[PDB]
Design a binder for these strands. Sequence first.
RNA 1: CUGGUCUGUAACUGACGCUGAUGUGCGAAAGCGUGGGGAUCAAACAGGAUUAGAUACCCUGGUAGUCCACGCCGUAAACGAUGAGUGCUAAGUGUUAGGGGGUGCCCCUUAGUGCUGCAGCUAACGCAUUAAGCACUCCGCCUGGGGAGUACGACCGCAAGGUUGAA
RNA 2: CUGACGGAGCAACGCCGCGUGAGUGAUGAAGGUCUAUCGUAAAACUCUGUUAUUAGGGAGAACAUAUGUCACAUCUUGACGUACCUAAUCAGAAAGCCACGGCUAACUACGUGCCAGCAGCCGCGGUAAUACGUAGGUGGCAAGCGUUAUCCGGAAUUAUUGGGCGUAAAGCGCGCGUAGGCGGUUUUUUAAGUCUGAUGUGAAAGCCCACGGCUCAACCGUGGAGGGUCAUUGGAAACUGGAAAACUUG
RNA 3: ACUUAUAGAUGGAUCCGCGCUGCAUUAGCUAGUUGGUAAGGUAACGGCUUACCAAGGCAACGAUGCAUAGCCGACCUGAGAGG
Lengths: 130, 136, 156, 80
Amino acid sequence: MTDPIADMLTRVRNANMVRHEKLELPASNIKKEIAEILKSEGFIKNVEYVEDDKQGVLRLFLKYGQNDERVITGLKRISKPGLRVYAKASEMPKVLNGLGIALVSTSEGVITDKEARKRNVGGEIIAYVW
Amino acid sequence: PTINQLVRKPRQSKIKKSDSPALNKGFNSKKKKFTDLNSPQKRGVCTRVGTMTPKKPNSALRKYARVRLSNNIEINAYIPGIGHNLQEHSVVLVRGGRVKDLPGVRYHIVRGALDTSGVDGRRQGRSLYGTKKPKN
Amino acid sequence: EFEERVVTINRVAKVVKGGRRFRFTALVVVGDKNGRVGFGTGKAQEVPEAIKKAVEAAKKDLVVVPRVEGTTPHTITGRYGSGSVFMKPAAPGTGVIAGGPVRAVLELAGITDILSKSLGSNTPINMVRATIDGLQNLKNAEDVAKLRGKTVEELY
Amino acid sequence: NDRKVYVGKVVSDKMDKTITVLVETYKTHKLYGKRVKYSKKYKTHDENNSAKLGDIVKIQETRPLSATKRFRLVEIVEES
RNA sequence: CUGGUCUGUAACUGACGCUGAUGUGCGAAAGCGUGGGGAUCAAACAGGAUUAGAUACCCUGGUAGUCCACGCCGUAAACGAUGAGUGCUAAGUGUUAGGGGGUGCCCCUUAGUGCUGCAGCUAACGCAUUAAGCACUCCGCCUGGGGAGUACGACCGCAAGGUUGAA
RNA sequence: CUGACGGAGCAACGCCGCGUGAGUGAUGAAGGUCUAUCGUAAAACUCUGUUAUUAGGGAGAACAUAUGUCACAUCUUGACGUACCUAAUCAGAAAGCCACGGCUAACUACGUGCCAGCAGCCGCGGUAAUACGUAGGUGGCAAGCGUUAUCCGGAAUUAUUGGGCGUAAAGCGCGCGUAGGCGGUUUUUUAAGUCUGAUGUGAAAGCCCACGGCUCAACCGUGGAGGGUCAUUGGAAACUGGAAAACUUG
RNA sequence: ACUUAUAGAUGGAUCCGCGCUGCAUUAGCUAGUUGGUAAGGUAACGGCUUACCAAGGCAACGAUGCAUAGCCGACCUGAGAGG
């Protein structure tokens, strides 16, 4: 339980393998950031925040689209305690030529892969969710 | 594939050994120990002629050469071609490595090469077992 | 018309209660120069019209390259077993790089402009699959945003 | 061009100020990239004071005025 | 005589830390330690017998051992050829002393096993609400074959012996 | 004084500056693998100076108390000091190519009856070597033929980018288990660091570039790319970081 | 055209730093290991010989031994890390 989000990350794609949703998951202050900034793009049925203390409970409720097909086709974290890879906000890579998105913490608040390119802010840029 | 113990403990490469280890070498007498050289060019001075019979894959007949290199060791050769140099005691230009189908021999002869010229029954080769001044 | 280039010409026999029976294993590439190619299981003992024997039954299985303008919009190194290929966008005059009969599913698609290499395998029974999966993971310029849930111009 | 605030901790000591301070830093190797932390030992000195059993301090790079020892600084954290 | 294991929630404390090369190490008959050492079978085989071909798997009997409370071990298909943190997309199911709701009547994992096997990956295969698949892990090995553990060898050590190491 | 630096037999060692044949030619013969092939082979006519008979050959460049009063200078700088050598210019040949099928790119065969023997991984002669002995050449070539062996992208057979676990060539005797790689939730006291940066902007011949002198190639140059936290330490506490606790059901 | 109070400078450098490779068939650690304390002196602090005393300084992290022993504009070269 040392990474409070770790498996939970790909549990999106390892829960919606056949587009399925029966998986309730635990919280963070970034499990108040992991599932809250891609609803910016209509990606979740509901994660509004975690409503408990002690980093509790949360319905994952992963929105699925109109072609029936994996909203999250595949997904990896490349940022875990035990894998610390820190880069700048300039050559943040091209996430499938920009087809994917990133949602991550920065060195000046909280941003996305829509901010690093136009704000020069960020630290351990995390993943490629698609 | 985990990187902690990777600077604690490293890995290897493959495992291969190069070609003709008792070749590319010139044996000392003053300081008695060999030279790791990989020289382009070299000589061959003769001790016998040599021939063994049992040949399966070809199943015709042809001999080879037993030429000793420097200062007391077994060094063995072969004459790949249709030319028989019924000779010995020569001073030549070495060819390094083995041609197909003879184990353990890695030492050969260039065409001409200061000892003889070659099997003079060739005129079309113009570039095989002795062939100089050939009309092209 | 399909440029009906012979893919691969292979021999097996079946050992029997007598003299074993040879055959010739083959197919044909069926190339619109738009991105798809299918195959016909012309299981027989004839070499030249196995090309035709695949032009017969090919159209059961052809799948689309969701073409971008002489290119592909996103980058791929997939494989459905072993044979893999790497694909990217590129400037529309680039020079063409390819391996086997995937000179008939890269040079016969709505791209032609890549840096495409076959990562690892490059055989008459892996180049196809390699490129087949490469093309099965694609998408047009207006549809990620819906299984996503926005408009696409909401990524940059 | 001034002189740094090198710091550290202490391990042991011998007769009449064979003093020392520990040295360490954040950095990595060029090959296989892990955040493994690392150290090397130094040579400061006092009358007898900066010494074992708790001397979290600072050190210097100056004229040693010393045998093969090198430092004159002690800028502390605390004691035990 | 003897612990834990814990099956139900957890009374106390308010992180009560994970692979674990320091150490210790310890682990199959035999090989090993007491003299007992025969209930006397089994090695050798005494011995017959053989199709053209037997000291033999065959055959009564036959000296370690076969009946062991004390020194230390370790090679085996430790063929278990499965290394251990985080959950997991149908759960039923065989059910386990013992049980969350309970009362020879229906049960769910806070649980446990073996699974037919959805679902999805791996590589042809198998795992599967009780996962080699996807995500954070360490001692690490592996990266075409021999020969090669033969020059030689360094250190443990009552013993099998190990445990090293270019060509 | 050079023996510091210079004047060079030049090794076809580097590769180039280009020169050794032309306007060519009706298919053109006396035909060399095959038995139409390289035959638009040939001849005998013409075209270039550029190799060769000579010639004058002066390419660079500024040297110097007394000359009159460190800016500095004349009555003071041709061994190679002959180059650019147009130069009329005859015809002053550019050795010879490999395997000789198909891949490494190649064309067919008499010799050859397993006697010699072909063969860059693949691979060939026992009575049609579309391999060999040899013979007129098409794929590359003309200062070039087969070989000599070194790391490069290729070798993705290092895995910093680009490493298997049951199975190639691979998983713990495990109760045990120091160092430490990793090492709960939330706020965190940190104000270091990353966000990145004001600054220092200290030169480069040339840099991520290009170009100008040069019969173009051997031999030189503007440097806008700041010289790579270098001469100042930072503001974002979202945290590996001087580190106060609380949560508890794990 | 002499000798001096004085200079800009020359190789350097008194020296600081990262420049500064491999051999685990080499950990119970060298007596100076820890560093203070000398008459001394090199354009140069000072275990640098000596000056005075206590080592566990080490400590299973490479103490130390230890084998080629120049580096750095060059060259073939990668897409790039550079190698």
